[PDB]
Amino acid sequence: VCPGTLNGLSVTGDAENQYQTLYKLYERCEVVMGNLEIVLTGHNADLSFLQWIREVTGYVLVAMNEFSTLPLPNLRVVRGTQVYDGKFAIFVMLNYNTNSSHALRQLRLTQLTEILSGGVYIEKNDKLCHMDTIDWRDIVRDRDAEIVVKDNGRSCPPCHEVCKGRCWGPGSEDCQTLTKTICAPQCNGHCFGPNPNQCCHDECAGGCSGPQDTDCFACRHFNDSGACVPRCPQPLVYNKLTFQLEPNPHTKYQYGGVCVASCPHNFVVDQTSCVRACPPDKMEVDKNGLKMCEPCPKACEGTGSGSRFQTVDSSNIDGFVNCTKILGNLDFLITGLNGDPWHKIPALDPEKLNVFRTVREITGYLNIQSWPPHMHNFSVFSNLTTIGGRSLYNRGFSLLIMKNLNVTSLGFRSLKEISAGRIYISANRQLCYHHSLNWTKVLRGPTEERLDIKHNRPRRDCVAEGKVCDPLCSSGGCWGPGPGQCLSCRNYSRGGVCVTHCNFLNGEPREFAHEAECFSCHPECQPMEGTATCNGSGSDTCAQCAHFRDGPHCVSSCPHGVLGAKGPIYKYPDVQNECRPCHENCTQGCKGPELQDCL
Amino acid sequence: QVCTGTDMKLRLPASPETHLDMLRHLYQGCQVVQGNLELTYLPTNASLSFLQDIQEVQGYVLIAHNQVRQVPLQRLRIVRGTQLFEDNYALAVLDNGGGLRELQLRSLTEILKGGVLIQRNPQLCYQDTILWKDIFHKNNQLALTLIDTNRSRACHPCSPMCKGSRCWGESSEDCQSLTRTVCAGGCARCKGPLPTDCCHEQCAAGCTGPKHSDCLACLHFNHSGICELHCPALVTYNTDTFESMPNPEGRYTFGASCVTACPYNYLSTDVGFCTLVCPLHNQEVTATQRCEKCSKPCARVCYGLGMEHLREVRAVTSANIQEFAGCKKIFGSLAFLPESFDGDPASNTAPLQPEQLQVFETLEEITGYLYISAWPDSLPDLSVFQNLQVIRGRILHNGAYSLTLQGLGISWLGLRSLRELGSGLALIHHNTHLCFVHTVPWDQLFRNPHQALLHTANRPEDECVGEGLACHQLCARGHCWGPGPTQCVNCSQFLRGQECVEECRVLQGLPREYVNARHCLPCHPECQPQNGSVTCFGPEADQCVACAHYKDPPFCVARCPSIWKFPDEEGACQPCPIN
Amino acid sequence: DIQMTQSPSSLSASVGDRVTITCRASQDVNTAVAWYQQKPGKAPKLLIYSASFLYSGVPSRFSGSRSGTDFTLTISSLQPEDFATYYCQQHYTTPPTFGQGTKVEIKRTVAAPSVFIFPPSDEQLKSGTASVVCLLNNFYPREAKVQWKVDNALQSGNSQESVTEQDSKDSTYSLSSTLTLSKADYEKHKVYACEVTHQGLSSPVTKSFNRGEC
Amino acid sequence: EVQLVESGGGLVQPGGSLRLSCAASGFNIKDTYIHWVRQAPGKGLEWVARIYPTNGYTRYADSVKGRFTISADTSKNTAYLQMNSLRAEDTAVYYCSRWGGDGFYAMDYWGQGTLVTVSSASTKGPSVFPLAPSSKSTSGGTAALGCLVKDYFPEPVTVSWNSGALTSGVHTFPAVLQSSGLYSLSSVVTVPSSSLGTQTYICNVNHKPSNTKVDKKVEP
Amino acid sequence: SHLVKCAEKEKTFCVNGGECFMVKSNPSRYLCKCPNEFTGDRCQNYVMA
Ligand SMILES: *[C@@H]1O[C@H](CO)[C@@H](O[C@@H]2O[C@H](CO)[C@@H](O[C@@H]3O[C@H](CO)[C@@H](O)[C@H](O[C@H]4O[C@H](CO)[C@@H](O)[C@H](O)[C@@H]4O)[C@@H]3O)[C@H](O)[C@H]2NC(C)=O)[C@H](O)[C@H]1NC(C)=O
Ligand SMILES: *[C@@H]1O[C@H](CO)[C@@H](O[C@@H]2O[C@H](CO)[C@@H](O)[C@H](O)[C@H]2NC(C)=O)[C@H](O)[C@H]1NC(C)=O
Ligand SMILES: *[C@@H]1O[C@H](CO)[C@@H](O[C@@H]2O[C@H](CO)[C@@H](O)[C@H](O)[C@H]2NC(C)=O)[C@H](O)[C@H]1NC(C)=O
Ligand SMILES: *[C@@H]1O[C@H](CO)[C@@H](O)[C@H](O)[C@H]1NC(C)=O
Ligand SMILES: *[C@@H]1O[C@H](CO)[C@@H](O)[C@H](O)[C@H]1NC(C)=O
Ligand SMILES: *[C@@H]1O[C@H](CO)[C@@H](O)[C@H](O)[C@H]1NC(C)=O
Ligand SMILES: *[C@@H]1O[C@H](CO)[C@@H](O)[C@H](O)[C@H]1NC(C)=O
Ligand SMILES: *[C@@H]1O[C@H](CO)[C@@H](O)[C@H](O)[C@H]1NC(C)=O
């Protein structure tokens, strides 16, 4: 299983670089989570490594290349979740050299059984044979899909006679197997034999080895522990006679096409389904560990796949104004800063990035591949507390920092956890202070295989130059050189900043401890010397009253003209500076408890 | 097309006289029975032709204690047996001795659950001729058959046309067809002996063709003509983007078919089921109703009989009368039995008193049925429920009745607020003192075509008229719940509020009023009565012709408020110079 | 329904001058009349209630009086800040009803506008249209005469104009006149010009530009 | 003093409906008379309706009887006005006000008002066409530069310079209705001619109804 | 081959030094040749590792 690609017809590097890229990605890939794109491949390419591909999630795009065959003998199902040109699941274009020296001759997709969505487009292939020898409607599920097979071959040979006129090539091994157009009337689907009793299950994608929901090659909807089902087991059982709904003791959540006992911690639960974000009329609500959709707050959407924005940009960034939680990914690409003339988009004023200083949560990945040259950090994300990892870059990484030439520190000082995905930090020639960080305290779950922090400023020099975090910080490291960037302080913290001590027994601004954080004492609290001033910021948590005592509370003075449940309250100070109620017949105060003491 | 069944089993009918009418109203014109089909205690020469339309029964079919020779259920194709009669029987024919001679269940080709019980029917000829094994669905079933052959009847052999000597009766049309035991391969149902005759797997009673659109009846579920495993979800899930989506083609599941919306009295749900019940941790919310999830702790719910801790309780007694205190809507039924007003020496439970029934004074809605077969002789009416507006009938007595009054001494109903009977039949009988039955606009209370009033042995209309007992002369159309001007449905003059009157006190009287939608509402207290003219135009102090005292613009005032104001020479409040 | 006639609908007085606004009720409503003041861009606010009484929070500059059905709102010293629409409203019957409303202008000397002309933007021309703008800045009174004569061709029916609110300091107005052309109508013309006259202008002023020169 | 905040405004088509609200703070609306008043463009004030939650009585102007319903929620301390069967002539700014006090019956409490536009026309974001300064925009020692905002709907559209940094010498001219059915707005600033090409002059046009923001630099 | 160079306006299509060229095809089809370190349809993204 591997991530697929999405470059369209474009390529990277020369023919060899492109080949090696194709090789490495699909070297042992069975299921392509994306498109299969083979463009400008030379005739000397060994593509036999593609032999293991069984399923393609998106489209298959083969164009402008020259090689004799396309070695995908085990490809059975093309899902067409992505359709090239919005029309066809399979593209075969211009697969020949104009000098006629080399050309594509065969596809040999002898196991191709079903295309769940999209049509087929095979055009301009001067020597491509046996394209009109395929009963394409046996393969394409959508009867309304367009199928184009035109300019393909001229002097091409007939199929082997055993093929009965249908083949993917000249050999007997190339004969096409029909699975639908030869079925009994009762089937309305693919079969594994001509009999009415040999029809494949409705939930079956591609062919099958039997009639059961467990006999199928691949599922159309959900895979429930081996069975292909239209849905996971529902929370309620419907009684068709009494119109009742009874509790279902055995439920599974819908998650990415597989039924699971419980939803992952970083996904919000819609009514029985793990979702990347709730429907437009619902909001996320915290319950017992899980988050749940309920009948809203600002729908502040992110960039990347599932969004119209490829990057934060001069025309996009204003959407994040007063945003505290980004519903999606967050890409910063080079063009998102330099500008993109193709769309008449101007450069982004770097200081507009300050708009992100209010964002605490990103539900997707954070991808920074470019950052303004005068900035040496990502302190603009200092307010970031968590990365969801519900959507992942190249289906793997939740945090990506690449080639930030002038960045020395990371920031994200408020960042506590990354719920999912891998971390990739590389080519940051100046990045220094990340070396000491204990990622096991931030990234949830096992991290040994998920951390890639290679090819950055050498630790030898980082340390040798003295570029280390304030030593007062505990094991776990810092996001930068300051105590305010410390993950966990050795002693106490103030305002989140690592400090040596609190002003408990001394110091004008007397404090008290709470969770190793220094908190100030009540304003009316009497400063103590040699002992703790207070055990709280309350008027009743101080060791001694600095002024006057009103019952349980220390006050600056005894109250006059205060309205309580009994009306206006007036109290006077005693010789002990304790407060007492004035005579009931007093005016605006008193000097004592007696009537004659009234003002 | 679709109606509900009944729940009597072998219990006698409350009113043998109206029993046949009951069945007709319930089943006439029905194709699908959302309930059990029960035809019991029928007389000879019964007009049962109304049953000819029935094709499917969701529950069981019970025919018992009938003197009829035949029951016209020729079109019945499926007995689904969701509920089964006794020892897992889908079909039961008992003690029909008069008595049945033929089954005539020509179209019956499928039973999904349960067996067949035919006993003590000393006329019946073909109970042991039918190949019940074929009728039983392929799926594992008890499929127990108890066939009593002690018919004591000389019966004719099946028609020559009935190859295999399998028939439901003596006619050629009665020949039994076989759909399973004659199939090729492993096909559950077929049109014939060939592989080409196999029916689609979603077909139940058989088919007219190979497609799921050709089914005679659906095995799992009927979606607008197409037999399918499930009703299309209202909301779907994208497995590639991990997102839920609205489904334009999504539908609600009602019984065994899709609907675009739930039928009246049924709740919609977010799972897409139509229910008579709102599941735990949810609320019933109006718009049309739906059941919504509780996001915050659920509100107090009052329950009636048949629900929760009262599920096993037969009637309201002094032991549980208090549970209805402060209730406006009761989730469940109410029932007042002789044991409710008499005592119980066993449980040592006191009888209900007239002053205790007052707990229902605040009651506006009953989700179940109201069954009153006993009532205090000190109460000439049911006015304790005068504020009752709606009876939903989601729970029915004997599966048929939502409002039943039997053996009461009440002279009139007095249920003036009652405006809707959401479902179920009404039965009023043996109320020999009860007059005001025919004075009620029952057609305005019923909502379903299958609803009707059944009545007998109530006070004779002639006696009511002879004594001059009738609706008030100001009562529109003569439609009333009782003899008083306060019990009238609508007034031909003015409603006043809760009493028909000739006019409002607009031109004459001290306590002057104004007209508002034929109601008579009081003029503001600060308003001056106008003799021979209109005192006021509304209830507010700025809607009067003249002030009773003096003005405080724009409103009339008795005395100025303390901006401290005083009554000036203008005859109006002005800000004071003394502060 | 009590009708309220308010007058004058327009007054003009210098700063520090005394200004009186009156309204006549169709009925004797005692003192059940209030005066409200609406500043540009703001909701109406209360000044005077019960005919003559000053509401707390309201500048002492205002007071009122009553004689029969005639009510008066008086300001002893008109300020620039008092440039607003005043309303006389009765609160005697229901509905409450308003008069037409009165505006008060700050009187000052007559002065000519500063006149200049803009060309269409390049991006606009590329959009298939063109807007040519002639603007009269900082003048009084608000009345002015602006004529479009492109290549001496007088334009009409293809222009719109707008007038700003009275300046809070100089008691002046500005006037902007926009001439609408299609790209084709713009191209066929070479010399665009705006002829402006004013009461405070001793000599008519014309500004112009050439297409392609900006 | 008290705080009154109107909302619920925006664009509605004729025959449709719009629900206005006005939140109150500093007092309990329950005990006072709640009024709505509307002002059509170019017109004076028209009284619409009142609710008096204490007894729940309402009154309406003849102009809205049978169409508008007024109410309030004393638990939300918020006033509401449900306007049905709206027509183009109902375009106005709708103000909320209250008669604070017991014997005091004048509108001492006022909000800001919200604009209700009733029109079959759909919304439209503005096109901004920056008007460069030149020797022909020069008068004495100063020169004008500006921006024209064309074809937007509905009004208003908010226009400022340099994100609000430049307000001095800035003159914004009230919108007019174009034959297109859309509105036109203009704004200019007069500056020392020596500042041209040196001082940033960006016209910032914000049209909420269409989620459209256009930033145009004005220069030769 | 099947390829031609982009027009000066079309060349704007590719970024980060990507070379713009076109397929000789009723609709215009843009391709870039990215530097080894760049990928994406316009060479807008960096290649990881
Ligand atoms: C799945 O559900 C659909 C929806 O209900 C269902 O379609 C319905 O089938 C019934 C037949 O069972 C149709 O009822 C007929 O409608 C025609 C209309 O002209 C009538 O003429 C028919 O009358 C016959 O029966 C009468 C008995 O009283 C005779 O007197 C008369 O002469 C005819 O013989 C009968 O009423 C119904 O109209 C359709 N509904 C729709 C919308 O088409 C479908 O059959 C179900 N399929 C399965 C497998 O369950
Ligand atoms: C449904 O999912 C199950 C896994 O839960 C698949 O079964 C696995 O298939 C792989 C294929 O190489 C085997 O290596 C595993 O050992 C299998 N696991 C088990 C428990 O058998 C199954 O093939 C999937 N079916 C479909 C149609 O997708
Ligand atoms: C990095 O974090 C990990 C996990 O918190 C630390 O490993 C734990 O160390 C404590 C020390 O007492 C042990 O009690 C735990 O059992 C260890 N956890 C596991 C999974 O082994 C690790 O020591 C930290 N490293 C640094 C430099 O702080
Ligand atoms: C919301 O946006 C406004 C825009 O000016 C800003 O002033 C305000 O501070 C923002 N509120 C926040 C960040 O909570
Ligand atoms: C982050 O970069 C800014 C750029 O001026 C700098 O002022 C600031 O001190 C840096 N923060 C840290 C922790 O280095
Ligand atoms: C978010 O930014 C505000 C800005 O004042 C700051 O006070 C607050 O502590 C920040 N929150 C986090 C999680 O850092
Ligand atoms: C009734 O049928 C049962 C079936 O086994 C038989 O044993 C019994 O003798 C029959 N009774 C009579 C009276 O024929
Ligand atoms: C009484 O009948 C009249 C007939 O028009 C109807 O308008 C009125 O609403 C009815 N009153 C009641 C209480 O139904």
PDB file of C-alpha atoms in Angstrom, chain A residues 57 81 185-188 196-197 202 221-222 230-231 234-236 238-245 254-257 267 270-271 273-277 279 287 294 395, chain B residues 34-35 58-59 82-83 184-187 195-196 198 200 210-212 220 230-231 237 239-244 253-255 266 270-271 273-277 279 295:
ATOM      1  CA  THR A  57      -7.956   4.722  -5.909  1.00  0.00           C
ATOM      2  CA  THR A  81     -12.369   8.710  -6.926  1.00  0.00           C
ATOM      3  CA  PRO A 185     -30.396 -11.859 -16.008  1.00  0.00           C
ATOM      4  CA  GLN A 186     -30.869 -12.294 -12.260  1.00  0.00           C
ATOM      5  CA  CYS A 187     -27.387 -11.020 -11.396  1.00  0.00           C
ATOM      6  CA  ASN A 188     -27.207  -7.391 -12.491  1.00  0.00           C
ATOM      7  CA  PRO A 196     -27.988 -17.539 -11.662  1.00  0.00           C
ATOM      8  CA  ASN A 197     -26.413 -18.961  -8.512  1.00  0.00           C
ATOM      9  CA  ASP A 202     -23.744  -6.570  -4.495  1.00  0.00           C
ATOM     10  CA  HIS A 221     -18.152   0.522   0.541  1.00  0.00           C
ATOM     11  CA  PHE A 222     -17.010  -0.792   3.908  1.00  0.00           C
ATOM     12  CA  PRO A 230     -23.190  -1.279   2.548  1.00  0.00           C
ATOM     13  CA  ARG A 231     -22.678   0.174   5.996  1.00  0.00           C
ATOM     14  CA  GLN A 234     -26.167   0.561  13.072  1.00  0.00           C
ATOM     15  CA  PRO A 235     -26.779   1.676  16.757  1.00  0.00           C
ATOM     16  CA  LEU A 236     -30.515   0.809  16.567  1.00  0.00           C
ATOM     17  CA  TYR A 238     -35.777  -1.302  13.562  1.00  0.00           C
ATOM     18  CA  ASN A 239     -38.908  -3.301  14.285  1.00  0.00           C
ATOM     19  CA  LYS A 240     -41.001  -3.230  11.111  1.00  0.00           C
ATOM     20  CA  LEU A 241     -44.187  -4.241  12.903  1.00  0.00           C
ATOM     21  CA  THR A 242     -44.120  -2.090  16.020  1.00  0.00           C
ATOM     22  CA  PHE A 243     -42.154   0.844  14.583  1.00  0.00           C
ATOM     23  CA  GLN A 244     -39.660   0.636  17.411  1.00  0.00           C
ATOM     24  CA  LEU A 245     -35.924   1.181  17.647  1.00  0.00           C
ATOM     25  CA  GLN A 254     -17.527   4.067   9.899  1.00  0.00           C
ATOM     26  CA  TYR A 255     -13.866   5.127   9.524  1.00  0.00           C
ATOM     27  CA  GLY A 256     -12.196   5.492   6.105  1.00  0.00           C
ATOM     28  CA  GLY A 257     -14.001   2.499   4.617  1.00  0.00           C
ATOM     29  CA  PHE A 267     -11.480  12.457  14.765  1.00  0.00           C
ATOM     30  CA  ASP A 270     -20.760  12.339  13.405  1.00  0.00           C
ATOM     31  CA  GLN A 271     -23.796  10.092  14.217  1.00  0.00           C
ATOM     32  CA  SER A 273     -18.981   7.995  11.452  1.00  0.00           C
ATOM     33  CA  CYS A 274     -15.497   9.400  12.089  1.00  0.00           C
ATOM     34  CA  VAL A 275     -15.239  12.661  10.054  1.00  0.00           C
ATOM     35  CA  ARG A 276     -12.468  15.214   9.272  1.00  0.00           C
ATOM     36  CA  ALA A 277     -15.010  17.989  10.014  1.00  0.00           C
ATOM     37  CA  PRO A 279     -21.524  19.077   8.208  1.00  0.00           C
ATOM     38  CA  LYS A 287     -17.681  14.727  25.645  1.00  0.00           C
ATOM     39  CA  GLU A 294     -23.999  18.655  17.410  1.00  0.00           C
ATOM     40  CA  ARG A 395      -0.815  10.711   3.886  1.00  0.00           C
TER      41      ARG A 395
ATOM     42  CA  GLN B  34     -48.807  -3.039   9.423  1.00  0.00           C
ATOM     43  CA  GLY B  35     -49.822  -5.346  12.196  1.00  0.00           C
ATOM     44  CA  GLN B  58     -46.368  -7.879   8.507  1.00  0.00           C
ATOM     45  CA  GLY B  59     -47.428  -9.972  11.485  1.00  0.00           C
ATOM     46  CA  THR B  82     -42.792 -10.515  12.524  1.00  0.00           C
ATOM     47  CA  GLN B  83     -44.907 -11.471  15.499  1.00  0.00           C
ATOM     48  CA  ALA B 184     -33.252 -25.208 -10.590  1.00  0.00           C
ATOM     49  CA  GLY B 185     -29.941 -24.976  -8.779  1.00  0.00           C
ATOM     50  CA  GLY B 186     -30.225 -23.245  -5.402  1.00  0.00           C
ATOM     51  CA  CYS B 187     -32.738 -20.564  -6.388  1.00  0.00           C
ATOM     52  CA  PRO B 195     -32.424 -21.689 -14.452  1.00  0.00           C
ATOM     53  CA  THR B 196     -33.960 -19.013 -16.648  1.00  0.00           C
ATOM     54  CA  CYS B 198     -35.047 -18.042 -11.288  1.00  0.00           C
ATOM     55  CA  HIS B 200     -33.959 -12.191  -8.167  1.00  0.00           C
ATOM     56  CA  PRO B 210     -35.476 -12.082 -13.348  1.00  0.00           C
ATOM     57  CA  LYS B 211     -35.115  -8.515 -12.095  1.00  0.00           C
ATOM     58  CA  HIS B 212     -35.598  -7.033  -8.634  1.00  0.00           C
ATOM     59  CA  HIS B 220     -36.213  -7.539   2.659  1.00  0.00           C
ATOM     60  CA  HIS B 230     -31.793  -1.296   2.569  1.00  0.00           C
ATOM     61  CA  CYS B 231     -33.503   2.058   2.261  1.00  0.00           C
ATOM     62  CA  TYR B 237     -20.230   8.787   4.149  1.00  0.00           C
ATOM     63  CA  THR B 239     -14.645   6.902   2.683  1.00  0.00           C
ATOM     64  CA  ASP B 240     -11.921   8.745   0.698  1.00  0.00           C
ATOM     65  CA  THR B 241     -12.339  12.231   2.272  1.00  0.00           C
ATOM     66  CA  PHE B 242     -13.732  10.989   5.657  1.00  0.00           C
ATOM     67  CA  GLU B 243     -16.822  13.273   5.414  1.00  0.00           C
ATOM     68  CA  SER B 244     -20.580  12.768   5.756  1.00  0.00           C
ATOM     69  CA  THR B 253     -37.898   3.772   6.297  1.00  0.00           C
ATOM     70  CA  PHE B 254     -41.485   3.130   7.208  1.00  0.00           C
ATOM     71  CA  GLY B 255     -42.391  -0.419   7.965  1.00  0.00           C
ATOM     72  CA  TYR B 266     -45.015   8.965  13.122  1.00  0.00           C
ATOM     73  CA  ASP B 270     -31.749  11.111  11.973  1.00  0.00           C
ATOM     74  CA  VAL B 271     -31.022   7.382  11.296  1.00  0.00           C
ATOM     75  CA  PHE B 273     -36.551   5.426  10.528  1.00  0.00           C
ATOM     76  CA  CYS B 274     -40.194   6.257  11.081  1.00  0.00           C
ATOM     77  CA  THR B 275     -41.181   5.360  14.621  1.00  0.00           C
ATOM     78  CA  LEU B 276     -44.032   5.525  17.083  1.00  0.00           C
ATOM     79  CA  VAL B 277     -41.455   5.988  19.809  1.00  0.00           C
ATOM     80  CA  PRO B 279     -35.577   6.521  21.618  1.00  0.00           C
ATOM     81  CA  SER B 295     -27.535  17.713  23.805  1.00  0.00           C
TER      82      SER B 295
END
